[PDB]
Amino acid sequence: DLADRFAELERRYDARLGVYVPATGTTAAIEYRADERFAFCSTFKAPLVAAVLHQNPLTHLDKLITYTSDDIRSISPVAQQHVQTGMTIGQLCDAAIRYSDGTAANLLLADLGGPGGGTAAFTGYLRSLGDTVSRLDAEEPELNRDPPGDERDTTTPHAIALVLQQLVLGNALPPDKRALLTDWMARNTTGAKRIRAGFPADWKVIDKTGTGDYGRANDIAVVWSPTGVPYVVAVMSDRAGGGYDAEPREALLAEAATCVAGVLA
Amino acid sequence: DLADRFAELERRYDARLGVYVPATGTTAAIEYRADERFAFCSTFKAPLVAAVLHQNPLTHLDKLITYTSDDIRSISPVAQQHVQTGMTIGQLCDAAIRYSDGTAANLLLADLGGPGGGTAAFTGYLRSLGDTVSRLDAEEPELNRDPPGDERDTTTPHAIALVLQQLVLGNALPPDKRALLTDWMARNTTGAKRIRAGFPADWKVIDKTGTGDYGRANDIAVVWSPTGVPYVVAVMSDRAGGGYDAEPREALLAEAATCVAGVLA
Amino acid sequence: DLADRFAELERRYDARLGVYVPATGTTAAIEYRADERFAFCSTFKAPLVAAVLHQNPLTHLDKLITYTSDDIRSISPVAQQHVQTGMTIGQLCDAAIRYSDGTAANLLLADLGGPGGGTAAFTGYLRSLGDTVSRLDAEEPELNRDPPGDERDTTTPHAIALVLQQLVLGNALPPDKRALLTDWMARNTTGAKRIRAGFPADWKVIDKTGTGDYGRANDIAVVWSPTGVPYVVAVMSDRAGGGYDAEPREALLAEAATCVAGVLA
Amino acid sequence: DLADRFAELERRYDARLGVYVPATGTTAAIEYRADERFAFCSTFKAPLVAAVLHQNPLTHLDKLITYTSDDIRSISPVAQQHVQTGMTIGQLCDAAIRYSDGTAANLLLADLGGPGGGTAAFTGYLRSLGDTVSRLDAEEPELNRDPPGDERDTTTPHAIALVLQQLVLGNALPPDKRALLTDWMARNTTGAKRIRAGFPADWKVIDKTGTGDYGRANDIAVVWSPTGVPYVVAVMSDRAGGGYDAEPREALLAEAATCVAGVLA
Numbered sequence A, B, C, D: 001d002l003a004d005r006f007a008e009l010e011r012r013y014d015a016r017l018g019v020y021v022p023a024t025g026t027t028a029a030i031e032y033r034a035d036e037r038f039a040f041c042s043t044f045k046a047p048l049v050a051a052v053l054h055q056n057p058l059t060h061l062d063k064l065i066t067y068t069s070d071d072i073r074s075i076s077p078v079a080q081q082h083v084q085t086g087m088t089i090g091q092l093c094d095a096a097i098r099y100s101d102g103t104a105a106n107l108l109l110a111d112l113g114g115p116g117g118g119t120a121a122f123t124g125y126l127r128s129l130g131d132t133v134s135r136l137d138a139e140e141p142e143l144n145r146d147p148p149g150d151e152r153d154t155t156t157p158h159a160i161a162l163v164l165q166q167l168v169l170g171n172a173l174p175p176d177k178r179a180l181l182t183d184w185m186a187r188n189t190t191g192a193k194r195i196r197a198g199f200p201a202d203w204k205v206i207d208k209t210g211t212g213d214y215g216r217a218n219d220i221a222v223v224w225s226p227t228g229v230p231y232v233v234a235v236m237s238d239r240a241g242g243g244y245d246a247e248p249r250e251a252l253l254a255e256a257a258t259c260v261a262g263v264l265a
């Protein structure tokens, strides 16, 4: 009956919807298109920050990174104001999560090092977490513009939910670094119209959004019930049949989240 | 499937839960003990105001009612501040809906006139709406104290939801009086932790609460989707197995509402 | 120059305005009718909670308080829904500050003990803080109704600011109790249209509001600059010349706060 | 008075600050080095779009401009994503205002035509607005690099504020083109930490930023009071004493804006 309502939303919004909520002790898993591939878009910036935190001590966050005007090749609301001043690693992590800063993600990818400007090392980090499906192949802004059917720069709701579960709820990160990642996502400024809009206000929601061409709109979140029980919610969508210029529908993710909230209440 | 989760809420909270959402063109009716009887408690105060509005011209709202300290019997946050000044019919209507003022409802019942302090005339008003099941037999605070199994001062989720549907969405009242009733319910101060707490913030919620002994906690609401689609939600509960002193559980109503929101999303 | 602009606000809004900001190391004191008396209204609920916290160990917050329908004499958005359940001292403190619950303040006054239902003991607590001007003489809701010129239930911007400074910035309370008082005021739900509205968003503002008859509208706040510099802001106003039914003007408090923010910038 | 606090900010941030707020019916002009010259930096891009709108019908917005990677020489977050596709004049206007795209400004200057890549024609356009002082002499990125004392690529807070006043509040443009310019500046992505950060959130702020060498940081804005009263605010700064590499300080402009908001309150 839940798949029937997801299918109605897919028809209402002319979209393909992917939802995954990992099973808990009390609740069964919610799976809609859990193993179909959807484009990361900016959702990769949350595990990216985890990759930077994982392989560096906390003192690395205070390292100052300098860059040029040539490095501003995508939507960079924070980095575009700090070409002359430079940006610390902590500010780049803060910027990548809370403002989805594209230049900040590229600098953090470079901070990981290796082939492809850090894209291979980020994929390797997901592999180390048990994610065998996901792959990052390009930097900003190219990774948002892969045509439908292309497996590059794609993940699945299943894979990204289990990744996010380990980062926030598991022990992929020590408690001090885990709290930083959680606080950045908790103070995100881009997800008000997605999973947060579909859950009651007394539920706590931390999230990282993704938006791209072909109507792509994603939101990955950890939510806590009023009783403090945590859940991982991955919602991914695109409108690829509507072409490159297809508009993303945030209301689709909000409605999908409301459906998920009904089963979790 | 939805009944399994309502019955799970009944089991979690040791309660009997009644839910009714009238069917629309797009949605099927939601029914969970929809025709079982539950005590009105203070939910009758919303149709009571409609009875007063329908029977009287608007100028009747300015009629001054004087009362003494002896007339205060139940929770009356407004009437207790106006013994010396008296209260206009409009103030009694405002107080009865928005603050669930018990003394205000008794004065409005008396304004209806007839046997039982207006309870026969109020019941007759429900009959004019097609509700042949519901009945009011006592005033505040006795109407909250009937033992389980007693049909007096009871309604059903089915009956009260259809009553509210006609008052707010239908044409039981002319538009000017309909707006007064609707705005009072929209600015209610007693329902923040019930149906309002179970719906996402971008859903508009107007409601009237009810609370009594035997763990009785009700909330009747009209809710509007983000796209402006209205739904009537009747949620009733009691915990009679815990005796007269059973405590109402507002969280039961919030969780039940979230389940309803999932089906309506 | 600043007093000329305070006087212009007084003329625009048909109001009497009181402002006090204690001097700091870098900034001089701001005073506009700083020692004239204004009605407390619900601003006393913040030092009231401080008196309860200071006089009792933290574990006292878990004591359950039971009350009756006769105790709901005032606007009590939280207490009115908990007659059957009771409320802990901690919940009453939360309700008194964040929802300005009138019954909760009366129950906390009773917890202080002594003559006048705690009004003498609360006043005595202010005396221990150096406040020789302020006085509480009635409970809710009477303390909001004193006519202009009556010194009862009045304070001054100077005195209430120095009280708030010691409670939040000083050592009137041990750090654990201080954090509870600060967090409650930080999550207050009643002050969005006053001092908070007059300061830039990157300034942190914690506040406790007061509103009454005779156009009375107060807001006492501790504000932190973007650089983390704290200031105490007390703004009090009434429109007593317009009578008992005079409407309070929240915009007066916001505009006055904006004037203060310019001098503190 | 107010000048004493601006000079305080000049000392705190080791900067030269220029402020101008045109007088209105209610307020007197605010002037602090209002007629001293400061470099345009990116602030000319707002009247630049007005020049392009003024000299052409709306259909000119749909003209496609093609360019190469060699034409990208400044911070160009949008133009670097459209080398292969090209961009319409309308997109160039959007990018120049909201993202301060340097390549977009050069293409729009070329669309104005004439010697110096359009700088003479843009200077002539300012003359048509009554601005006899300001001048643009170079393109991006050279216009940010003029040494102190050089009059090239300079304006004054007085002149540009009156220019902005005519473009947004006056009748320099027909209503449809004025609305496009207004909406573009309203949706700017570069000024969150400047004038916008210094005004309360309920003040509407549209702005155009400027940043260059020698610590140059400008922001020209139109702000609306909560009552809908508009004001033009020009805030310019440089820190030439710190050399070419002197860092701009955005907080200076936010603090100066807070000072302005206090007197406009």
Ligand SMILES: CO/N=C(/C(=O)N[C@@H]1C(=O)N2C(C(=O)O)=C(CSc3nc(=O)c(=O)[nH]n3C)CS[C@H]12)c1csc(N)n1
Pocket: C041, C042, C043, C074, C075, C099, C100, C102, C141, C142, C144, C145, C189, C190, C191, C208, C209, C210, C211, C212, C213, C214
């Ligand atoms: C005898 O009169 N008593 C009261 C009274 O109980 N006032 C209290 C007081 O100071 N309170 C405060 C608060 O903390 O400010 C508030 C918060 S102010 C407020 N009022 C609204 O109507 C609204 O929609 N939003 N907000 C934020 C509620 S009343 C209580 C009163 C209220 S208006 C009036 N003329 N009198």
Ligand SMILES: CO/N=C(\C(=O)N[C@@H]1C(=O)N2C(C(=O)O)=C(CSc3nc(=O)c(=O)[nH]n3C)CS[C@H]12)c1csc(N)n1
Pocket: A041, A042, A043, A074, A075, A099, A100, A102, A141, A142, A144, A145, A190, A191, A193, A208, A209, A210, A211, A212, A213, A248
């Ligand atoms: C080649 O890149 N194309 C992008 C792009 O830059 N994508 C990134 C991505 O996923 N980003 C995110 C985010 O984290 O969601 C965002 C936040 S989304 C957003 N923007 C608003 O202006 C707004 O008002 N609300 N919201 C929710 C910005 S783009 C970047 C794009 C943006 S819209 C579209 N059709 N394409």
Ligand SMILES: CO/N=C(\C(=O)N[C@@H]1C(=O)N2C(C(=O)O)=C(CSc3nc(=O)c(=O)[nH]n3C)CS[C@H]12)c1csc(N)n1
Pocket: B098, B187, B188, B189, B190, C075, C077, C098, C099, C100, C189, C190, C213
């Ligand atoms: C919607 O519920 N939430 C509330 C709440 O209870 N609001 C109530 C509401 O509608 N209120 C009203 C009024 O009737 O206008 C008021 C006005 S009280 C009042 N006004 C007068 O003009 C007067 O002469 N006397 N008095 C006593 C304040 S809040 C309460 C709340 C309290 S604190 C907070 N953050 N929310």
Ligand SMILES: CO/N=C(\C(=O)N[C@@H]1C(=O)N2C(C(=O)O)=C(CSc3nc(=O)c(=O)[nH]n3C)CS[C@H]12)c1csc(N)n1
Pocket: A075, A077, A098, A099, A100, A189, A190, A213, D187, D188, D189, D190
């Ligand atoms: C006031 O600015 N605040 C921003 C911010 O920078 N918003 C920007 C804004 O207006 N944006 C826009 C757009 O141009 O429409 C977009 C879309 S950009 C885009 N659209 C397409 O259709 C497409 O094909 N490709 N791309 C790249 C998203 S946010 C950025 C912000 C970023 S995170 C946050 N909380 N705020």
